[PDB]
Amino acid sequence: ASNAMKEKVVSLAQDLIRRPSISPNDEGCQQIIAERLEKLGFQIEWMPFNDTLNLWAKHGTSEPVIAFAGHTDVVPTGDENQWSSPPFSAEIIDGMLYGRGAADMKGSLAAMIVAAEEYVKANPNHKGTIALLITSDEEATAKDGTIHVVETLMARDEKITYCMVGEPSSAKNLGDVVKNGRRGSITGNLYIQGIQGHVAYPHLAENPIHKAALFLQELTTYQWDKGNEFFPPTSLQIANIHAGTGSNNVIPAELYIQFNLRYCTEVTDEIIKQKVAEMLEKHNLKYRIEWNLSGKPFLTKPGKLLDSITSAIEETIGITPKAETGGGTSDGRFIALMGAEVVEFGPLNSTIHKVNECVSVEDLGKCGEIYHKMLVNLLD
Amino acid sequence: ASNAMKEKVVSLAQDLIRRPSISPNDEGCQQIIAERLEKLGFQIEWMPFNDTLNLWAKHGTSEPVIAFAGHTDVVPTGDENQWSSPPFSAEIIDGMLYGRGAADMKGSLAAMIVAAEEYVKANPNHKGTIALLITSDEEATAKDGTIHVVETLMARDEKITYCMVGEPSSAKNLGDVVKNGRRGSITGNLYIQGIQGHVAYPHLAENPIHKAALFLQELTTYQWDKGNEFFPPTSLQIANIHAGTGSNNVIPAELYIQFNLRYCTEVTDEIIKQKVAEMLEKHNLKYRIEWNLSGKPFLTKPGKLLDSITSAIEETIGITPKAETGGGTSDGRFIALMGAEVVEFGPLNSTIHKVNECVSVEDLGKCGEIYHKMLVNLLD
Numbered sequence A, B: 001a002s003n004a005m006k007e008k009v010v011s012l013a014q015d016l017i018r019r020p021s022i023s024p025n026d027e028g029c030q031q032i033i034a035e036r037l038e039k040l041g042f043q044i045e046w047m048p049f050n051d052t053l054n055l056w057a058k059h060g061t062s063e064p065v066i067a068f069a070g071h072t073d074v075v076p077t078g079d080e081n082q083w084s085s086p087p088f089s090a091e092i093i094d095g096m097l098y099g100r101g102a103a104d105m106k107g108s109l110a111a112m113i114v115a116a117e118e119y120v121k122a123n124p125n126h127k128g129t130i131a132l133l134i135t136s137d138e139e140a141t142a143k144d145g146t147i148h149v150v151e152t153l154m155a156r157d158e159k160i161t162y163c164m165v166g167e168p169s170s171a172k173n174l175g176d177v178v179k180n181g182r183r184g185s186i187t188g189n190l191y192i193q194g195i196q197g198h199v200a201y202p203h204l205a206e207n208p209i210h211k212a213a214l215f216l217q218e219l220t221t222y223q224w225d226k227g228n229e230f231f232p233p234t235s236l237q238i239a240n241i242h243a244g245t246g247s248n249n250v251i252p253a254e255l256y257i258q259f260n261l262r263y264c265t266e267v268t269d270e271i272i273k274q275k276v277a278e279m280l281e282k283h284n285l286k287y288r289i290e291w292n293l294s295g296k297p298f299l300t301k302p303g304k305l306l307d308s309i310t311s312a313i314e315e316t317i318g319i320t321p322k323a324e325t326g327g328g329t330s331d332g333r334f335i336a337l338m339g340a341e342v343v344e345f346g347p348l349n350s351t352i353h354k355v356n357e358c359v360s361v362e363d364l365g366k367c368g369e370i371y372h373k374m375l376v377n378l379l380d
């Protein structure tokens, strides 16, 4: 009779998926959420800043404080034509909920919310505080999101004891992985200068695409490290590359390369910057580069939260998750600044940021059950 | 007292440079030209087709027919901020006329026009026909320009005996080079397919930039040939390269590469297509490619026109031009279809398609003198 909760999770998820909340625009997601939480006695606190909307919702007044954390923004869809169903359709086909944000992360956001709602309804005088910390910019610059909330709470010495981040942690089967940390993320925006001219007079010009070809090949194959006991290896990906005026008979003046590294503690942001500089010098390239550090590697100190979620997954679906630190990053690293233990769990990540993103509705239901059991394990 | 003609050439040139005639838009250039030719008794015939304007102007009724050929369109400027003077300012600074189209090819277009005007004024009952064949799209697709005029003339068996193309042929000093032929030009528009996804989950995706890096490096360094007695070597240039959604945490689905070859007769369009296909296969790349042949190599049969222009340059500025076939292409190849001898001569090409394009005003004056002497040599 908790197929009832499963339906609540699914309809909320669909609600949210239908809102085209490309970072940092919330498109009304948090309003929906805040409305239903308020009706159940949660204290609502809005913390907008610049173009970002943030929500801090609480039920309870004392420690321990357990916060569910997540984001309502989603990455761009791409041509809606490339999608079998419209990206914001929230269609359910053969047990799969389709849509941008279905797996990253509106599905599990809905699951966490319903778990919190149901727990609080069942246990009005529960020990501790159940909170939700929701931002509309996790996917982009993220300068005014979760980190703004964290700064506000710290400045008035408000505490978070435990934080469960609902990012999609699972690899092949729901519950097979939880995350106890993340690699860092740093992006280079690299401009290599050539000299514009006529394609048929290349000796009077300098084609930066040709000059940088070897560099590009070395950059994409260079082995930064082999990981270590705590993290998978550092990985570099070129996200964007652009040169040219659109004309076929003009040599472009400049080549733009944007590349990102998800890095482990075998290297640092400074080691990465120095090595790239050294590669550019070795290839005698004229350039300018702008570096943007999104975050450093982070590991949480394991304790009762890791125990509680690991046990909840075992108790609900019968397997033991492996604790890992791969994949992307999350706002967990900000929340760790408060001294909170941070652990992540959510649905399959196999379709995130892809065309035809989707999530199993059976998995969303079990997620709700798992998040609920986690609360019981922690507070009771 | 032919500093007088020099001033006519310069002011016409400035007139034309001020008109932002990005291919195929004439922006009124040919109207100016046709107006001043008509006043001197030239028969004007407009041959517009689609978005291209073409002009066929004649003085005389009999053979031999000598046609001056050129184009009023210019390649895009780029950010006007990168220019010392506005690109359409037509400023003269220290003996240099600055502007897009100054050297390619409004300067020499003006010189040819004034040479024709002055010759016809001096010799109203001249032998032969003096013609001008002017198009507003030489630089772009060129499907409706000079080739449209050529087709029209051939269809009514109208003849061109000799054609002087005023493209900028000179390398270091005015008159050091004339052109008796050109390499071919073929462009590949290449799309390499990957799989879009999350930068931090590259194993669930396929980054086409990474997959194609080695190919790109091989393509830009592959030696097609070493030229031969008639042409310089084949040269490949990548003009445009684009991949990415603008996001730094998404792996792009597709990489676009546009590349052009200026090729000599050691290879063919078919050999080029087959080799590129073979390189792509060797690197196991999934792709689609669209080929666009702009023209094949061409050599003119030397005769009285090459003699006349070579002698005119010697007689006017004292040096002997070398006959060469390098640089870009020209509409000469179309006009050759009529059986005409085609030779090109014009000012320095060192700044064409570049920022701060300019041309020496002293050279424009001597060009006028050279084109005039050429007519005398041919007709008298």
Ligand SMILES: N[C@H](CCC[C@H](N)C(=O)O)C(=O)O
Residues within 6 Å of the ligand: A138, A139, A140, A141, A142, A185, A186, A187, A260, A294, A295, A327, A328, A329, A330, B200, B248, B249
């Ligand atoms: N500006 C941040 C956004 C991170 C979003 C995170 N969810 C991920 O892509 O793992 C970065 O480039 O790391």
Ligand SMILES: N[C@H](CCC[C@H](N)C(=O)O)C(=O)O
Residues within 6 Å of the ligand: A200, A248, A249, B138, B139, B140, B141, B142, B185, B186, B187, B260, B294, B295, B327, B328, B329, B330
């Ligand atoms: N669509 C033609 C334009 C040629 C213009 C010609 N003046 C040159 O660039 O040499 C090509 O790609 O060859």
Ligand SMILES: [Zn+2]
Residues within 6 Å of the ligand: A071, A104, A105, A138, A167, A168
């Ligand atoms: Zn997410």
Ligand SMILES: [Zn+2]
Residues within 6 Å of the ligand: A075, A104, A139, A352, A353
């Ligand atoms: Zn994401």
Ligand SMILES: [Zn+2]
Residues within 6 Å of the ligand: B071, B104, B105, B138, B167, B168
């Ligand atoms: Zn030209």
Ligand SMILES: [Zn+2]
Residues within 6 Å of the ligand: B075, B104, B139, B352, B353
């Ligand atoms: Zn040109």
